[PDB]
Amino acid sequence: DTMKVINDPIHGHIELHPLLVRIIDTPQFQRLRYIKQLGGGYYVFPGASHNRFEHSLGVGYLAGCLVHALGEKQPELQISERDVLCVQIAGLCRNLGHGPFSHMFDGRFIPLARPEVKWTHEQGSVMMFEHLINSNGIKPVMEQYGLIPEEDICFIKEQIVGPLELWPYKGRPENKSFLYEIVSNKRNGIDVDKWDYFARDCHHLGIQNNFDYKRFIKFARVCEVDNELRICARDKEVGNLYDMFHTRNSLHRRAYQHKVGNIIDTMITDAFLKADDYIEITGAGGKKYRISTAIDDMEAYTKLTDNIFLEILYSTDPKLKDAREILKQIEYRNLFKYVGETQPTGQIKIKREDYESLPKEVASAKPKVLLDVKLKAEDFIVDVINMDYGMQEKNPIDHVSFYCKTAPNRAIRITKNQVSQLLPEKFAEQLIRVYCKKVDRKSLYAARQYFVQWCADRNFTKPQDGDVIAPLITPQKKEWN
Amino acid sequence: DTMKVINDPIHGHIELHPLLVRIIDTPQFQRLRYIKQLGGGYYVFPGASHNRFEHSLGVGYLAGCLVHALGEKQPELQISERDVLCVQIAGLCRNLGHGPFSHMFDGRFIPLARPEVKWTHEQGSVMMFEHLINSNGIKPVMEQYGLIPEEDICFIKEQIVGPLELWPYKGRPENKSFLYEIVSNKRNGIDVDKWDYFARDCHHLGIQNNFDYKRFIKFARVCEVDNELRICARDKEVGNLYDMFHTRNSLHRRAYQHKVGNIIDTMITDAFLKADDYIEITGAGGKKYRISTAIDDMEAYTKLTDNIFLEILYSTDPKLKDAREILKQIEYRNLFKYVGETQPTGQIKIKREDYESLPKEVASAKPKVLLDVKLKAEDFIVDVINMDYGMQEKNPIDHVSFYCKTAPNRAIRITKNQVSQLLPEKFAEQLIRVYCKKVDRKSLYAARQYFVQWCADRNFTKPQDGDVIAPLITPQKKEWN
Amino acid sequence: DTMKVINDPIHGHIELHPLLVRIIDTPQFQRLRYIKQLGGGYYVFPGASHNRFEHSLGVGYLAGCLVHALGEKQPELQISERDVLCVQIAGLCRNLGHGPFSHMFDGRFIPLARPEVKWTHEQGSVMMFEHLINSNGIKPVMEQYGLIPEEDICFIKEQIVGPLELWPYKGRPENKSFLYEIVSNKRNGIDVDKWDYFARDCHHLGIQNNFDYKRFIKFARVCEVDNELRICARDKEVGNLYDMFHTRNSLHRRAYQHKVGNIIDTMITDAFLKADDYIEITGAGGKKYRISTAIDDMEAYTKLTDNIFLEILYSTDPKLKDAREILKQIEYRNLFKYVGETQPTGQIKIKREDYESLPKEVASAKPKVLLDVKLKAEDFIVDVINMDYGMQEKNPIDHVSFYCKTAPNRAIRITKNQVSQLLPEKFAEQLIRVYCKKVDRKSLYAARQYFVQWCADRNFTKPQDGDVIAPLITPQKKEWN
Amino acid sequence: DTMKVINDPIHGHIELHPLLVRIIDTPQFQRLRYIKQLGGGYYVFPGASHNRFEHSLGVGYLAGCLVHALGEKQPELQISERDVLCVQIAGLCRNLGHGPFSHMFDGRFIPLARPEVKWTHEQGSVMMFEHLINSNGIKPVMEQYGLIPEEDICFIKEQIVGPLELWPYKGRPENKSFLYEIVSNKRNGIDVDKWDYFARDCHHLGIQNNFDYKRFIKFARVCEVDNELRICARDKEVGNLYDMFHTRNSLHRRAYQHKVGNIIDTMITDAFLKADDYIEITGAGGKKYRISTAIDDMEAYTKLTDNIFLEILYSTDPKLKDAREILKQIEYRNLFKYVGETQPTGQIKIKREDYESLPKEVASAKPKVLLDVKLKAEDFIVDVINMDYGMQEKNPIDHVSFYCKTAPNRAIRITKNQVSQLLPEKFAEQLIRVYCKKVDRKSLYAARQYFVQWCADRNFTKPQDGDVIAPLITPQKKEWN
Numbered sequence A, B, C, D: 001d002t003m004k005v006i007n008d009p010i011h012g013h014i015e016l017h018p019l020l021v022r023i024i025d026t027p028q029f030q031r032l033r034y035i036k037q038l039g040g041g042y043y044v045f046p047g048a049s050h051n052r053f054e055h056s057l058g059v060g061y062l063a064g065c066l067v068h069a070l071g072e073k074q075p076e077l078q079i080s081e082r083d084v085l086c087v088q089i090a091g092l093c094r095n096l097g098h099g100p101f102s103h104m105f106d107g108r109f110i111p112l113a114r115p116e117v118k119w120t121h122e123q124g125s126v127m128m129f130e131h132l133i134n135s136n137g138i139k140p141v142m143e144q145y146g147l148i149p150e151e152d153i154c155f156i157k158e159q160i161v162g163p164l165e166l167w168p169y170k171g172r173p174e175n176k177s178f179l180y181e182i183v184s185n186k187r188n189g190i191d192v193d194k195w196d197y198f199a200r201d202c203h204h205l206g207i208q209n210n211f212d213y214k215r216f217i218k219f220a221r222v223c224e225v226d227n228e229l230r231i232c233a234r235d236k237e238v239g240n241l242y243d244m245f246h247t248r249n250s251l252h253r254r255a256y257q258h259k260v261g262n263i264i265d266t267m268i269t270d271a272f273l274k275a276d277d278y279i280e281i282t283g284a285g286g287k288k289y290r291i292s293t294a295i296d297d298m299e300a301y302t303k304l305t306d307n308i309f310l311e312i313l314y315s316t317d318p319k320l321k322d323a324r325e326i327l328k329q330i331e332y333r334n335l336f337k338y339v340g341e342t343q344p345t346g347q348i349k350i351k352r353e354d355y356e357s358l359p360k361e362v363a364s365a366k367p368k369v370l371l372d373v374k375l376k377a378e379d380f381i382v383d384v385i386n387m388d389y390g391m392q393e394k395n396p397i398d399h400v401s402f403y404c405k406t407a408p409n410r411a412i413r414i415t416k417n418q419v420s421q422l423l424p425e426k427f428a429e430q431l432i433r434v435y436c437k438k439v440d441r442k443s444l445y446a447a448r449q450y451f452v453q454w455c456a457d458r459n460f461t462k463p464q465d466g467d468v469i470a471p472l473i474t475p476q477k478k479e480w481n
Ligand SMILES: Nc1ncnc2c1ncn2[C@H]1C[C@H](O)[C@@H](COP(=O)(O)OP(=O)(O)OP(=O)(O)O)O1
Pocket: A005, A006, A007, A008, B044, B045, B046, B206, B207, B254, B260, C212, C215, C240, C405
């Protein structure tokens, strides 16, 4: 039949097995063509027009590359073609659950629209995968190419979301444990999904990538660590791994957490919230769902993409006026205004349940400056951003196993001081951005005074531009000089 | 003010004048974010997710680069800042008139939906530009930055569409004639729009570009040719100019005229035709327009983007069933089947008014093979493609002026035989692709027999796979050996 | 053992089998570090610092890629690991015979220094390979890794130089015929050596490469053609193959035949000729050789690299004064002056044995202008350059075999008219460059008059700048208008 | 006059002022074609064939870019074309002083050959520049283009080496202080030399660069800081500046301090030391100089390049046997063996004058294992490497001035806690590599035991492979856990 060839600008010419083609040529997978990888990021980086679809192809490709390379170097692992196909399918399908504008949907909209429910793209991907399989008669195709659907569907879902409940997985046994480290690596965060987005996002954003995934593959091996088979890196590659996470952090600082990209995501979310009572999406049995409830029905969710943005923008319904107007403001670039950024000092850390009280706190600050306008809580947005190396406070290199040239089957551990004094001492921090919904010059001036006063009151760090934006407030603080 | 800086993956960090920002931050310009540069090509090249918006920024940037470079080298041209801004604005806005899926709209849909009307993206761009200016109070902003709206609006439109009726232009006089060669060069086709799409399309398609626009700029000069000031290239760069057009032709062969991309464009066009009576788009004064009539009202046209595809795909109306079903077949990748490709021999050239007669001709061919299914005219699609070097049958290098190192103010001509014997003897040709709407094995086999027989009957070239797909037909033709 | 891994900027991370490492770590191979790929080109393109060593690694790598790919797709070919190693070794070693400044040595110096002898880099490579094997005890290492030295040494040499004299090869039989098409393809010129230098030269020159060798590999198959197994390309890739040779021609026009790079090569050759009686190189048994006789003894030739240039430049011997002075003039950029370029028309073609008569012919021309300086034959240099598609007058695509999607084991042929009307009508031409050794403005003016007059007298093409450089000469010629 | 245009693979098409061309076309500048940028690095990274010449062109080009950009944005700085040319010349000429194999010469050879003298490439560059000017009649050419030689030669030398003896410079006054921050920035290390080598080294090494110099230029301004005009960065670019130094550190870890590249540099240095009594280089007045004394005479130093390596390698003099043999071992890849790497803990820091005592210390360690070979001090090499952010222990961002968007003429300071907790806590460290000159298996095993024992005895960090290479030694140390 067909090994189809696909030309990808990041990976070049990729071969797709006919079973992968069958999965790809479905409304559930093709849907990813209409969901932007970086959401609101496109509105700041005009190169970032790329969608989840092409990222998914790349993830499936790299998953295949890594499992093949391991199998060629270590025939004793007994990786079968069936294993390779299952890993490729998981790599291909791990983005199926994303919603309009990607992280905006799961990171901002759903938590506000449906605070009671716990929703992740991972869960969505498993549900959509099930829907894809059942709606398109995939199971007989899997059997035709040597898969065993019961075991292998389970294995694929487990790769995506983790244990579907002592060895906790049912899709494959402990001697194939390393296969769970490829698509979504919950142990240390080194997975093929990161490798594709590093390369792809960089190519589109116009920022250059310093991580070499092909080198890592060449140096990768499977070793026994604590009775378990794990993918291990060559010892001397440790520096490269530190750099990989540094790259990830840089991408988040420069692009994914860009202050204006975040505010555009915030405005789109607001628009969706105001549209939520009036947009109807037809799901299974002709039932109607909302933007916020399409996650409950996969048939409906299949039709929930970036197009919602344009449905609202182009609407004529008076009911959608408020939602439509917010999107129109985005088009005119009448954005909420960035006021500034600060961080907590020392051990002190800000709990999630306090986020809603923060705009009130800013509005309550009493700056000794003459102000013609005074602002209220609702005029402020406070966006708290948790930046880490993927494992909260932990160093993921403490969770990585290495091997040495002289004994390639012997796994070892490497600690931070065995590497460099010039590495991060901490692996998590919080950034606090403040914005003002009132966009006029007088309001922005006032907002800067409240903000810097609030920072001083909370003993947060001095904003970078603090002496310029609030010259009358910054002298009060001793610690700021 | 101060400039905005925009990071573009092709051009890096670009400066935008505040007037350009004002023009960009409008619904008329932001619309271009929702129109794919390569239309159906995305469905073949997954990297080609890029939209007309980012291309437009690039064109505006390069227009500025060229006019600046000329002014720095030749102060005697008297290029003013006003001229630079007008050239940038034209470059920025020359894509405003594109419709859903770009060339699909003006190349396929409108000629079928509205055969009586003459429509071009150029005309559309002028109409949209006027609408953009008038709807957003741009004229006072132009005066603020030293533009004279009456003259300069005229100049910008003329750059986009050409003479609005010897010297035929009103926006600038003959001593600034060279300025009309930058954004859309009607004399020879060497303009900045090509330079951006060569680099941008290549970056996204995953194909590399051989043309160096920065070299060309470095060697560009303005000289008097026939009492007119024109942009001239250095003599020895002639090979590079031939190569530029070769690059353009290669991009068309490999990507823009890809056989499956074209059939996807064809299917989308069919879907739009079937949807045309039922999709309603609200224009000026609340009036309703169709997909095919939105070009008559710019307010309506502003809201006509790629989104139409998703509106149809997600529709529930039984009236839209036929349109919706076509798009669903695209998603399942049930595409019309490629039968093959042929070309005319010699003097024979196929007129546009004969395109409709061609499917009938294929169905009329009488292959001497026993056939279980016979096919009708409507089961065939015949797609005729005109490939040239941008000036129909002419060599555009015959319309280029050069200068020599020893006399940089003296314009000269170079003929083909002064360059190389290894160049094309002709500069235009036609490709004929045939597809079959019936997708089953028996029908496809039959379609191949009719096709090859038709080629033989018309003394078209032997299809490349002719001996394999029609082993019983190919021996009859003497000419094919 | 395990592989060494080498990071190459063109190909990334390359694995080298330990036998290849043994071959590489020898004075005969390491020698290639001291020989510039593009010779005098470095003096025009400052990026072109790259040497034959890294090019050789790339060729060996790509040879391995192609043979592996073929073997994986078609197990029935019976490609063994022994075959893969032999192909890699041939790819690695096919550059061993190059001399100082690469093509300058075999293309310019040796034919002038030793007109009686017939010498090629290919012959040199075979001799050096033999010397490498024998001097470094490689044969037992070959046996250790499963090679059979007698048969396999023969096979490797045959890949490099062709038949060492009905099936003409002894290293492998007709059922492995396709293996001879990989490293140096005598049938059509599509080999891995071209693919490495396209990518590498482009990377260093600062000119971008439009040929995708990875796509070619993906579409390559072995089919029976006229009782012989040959590498065949997919039908629809024919355009890409035409483009590959177009790319080669463009690299020669822009870079390898750069007019000043050629004149620098010419000057270096002159310097070597003047140094040849006095530089001594110690060879086998302590015998002394000349630059021109080092090719007779491999031990001596091992020590003959670009260093010769610096030995001359840094010399103090009065005997080397004339040679040294030429090189000093190169450093001051006192080069021979470019006068112009022309080509023959029609039947006329210029034979190698006429090259020496050409400067006399230019000096003999009688331009009707009063001239204050007159020049002699020795003041002129005439450089004749043969540009073709690698097979003299032939179209190498007439020597390529293809397959179609519907019958992948069935080889077919494709003619020029089955492809495009926009292709070259001829596949060979000659370029004639004229230079003047007298650099002053009066002499250069005179040289231009003689040159254009000579062109007219011989009915050569009109020089591009002819109307500017010789305004009194060009009107006499009818055919120039 | 008109510019020469040069095509550079990093920067594309560069314009060179005719005075720059005059400087470039001299034996003193052309010499840099024969000195490899990365020295022994080429023997590890085969892409790193690049020489100091092309790097110098790039530095001159970027120096020009930065000074032009500042002048265009801030006309009030009064930057003249004279200033631009002087900055370009300094940028062009700041690499003139490098010796064979670049850092090997000043970093390893001269300190061992001539411990009494203090020599730097900077000092060498000033001396060579003076020699270049005087030997080639450059001063009249400078006057012709509007330079004032006395003042401007002084200015150029000051940019290269710093104050030639309160404002300490004589070439320009305090109101042009910012001009001293461009070519070699002693205040904070942000200069154009780094920018060129980041891009160029990465391009050739096959490692990707994450620093965007064009972005920095776009955001750069000159502001008053402490009565002095200095180049300032936009506040929010601070992360990018931290990253610039991170990039520099990564290039040193991965490439410039590569353990095998360093040992090759060490072996070449040993060969030069053994050759030093016998190589003669003819300098001014026919006087003879040694490799170690050519730095005393510029005429001699002009002829001291990488060629020395080949002169030794190809020599027949019995006196050069020992030097020649070392180079031959490099060719066979019989290198000294890497034993391992460690670092000091805490306060402990190792002074340069202690380096000689270190091999003795390793040999003195008493590992409690029966060993069949014992090794002596001369069998060990200990290489101590100082890694910092360019300012020893200091954070160079503490020496950078920033501006904010709302007050672009007001300079501010940013402290480390105002940026991120995820940054380095220390900015300097030492790496200690140990190698063994005895290459046999028994000796290497013994060397590993001495090494790890020494680490334990000195409370240095545990070697990464310590548990594998010295399983009997590592358990004794408490702190290694
Ligand atoms: N000449 C080319 N260079 C680079 N990419 C190309 C070229 N031609 C096509 N592609 C891209 C488009 C697709 O992403 C991928 C496969 O295209 P192509 O090989 O034409 O497949 P196809 O499915 O249309 O052909 P068939 O089914 O006839 O093999 O390569």
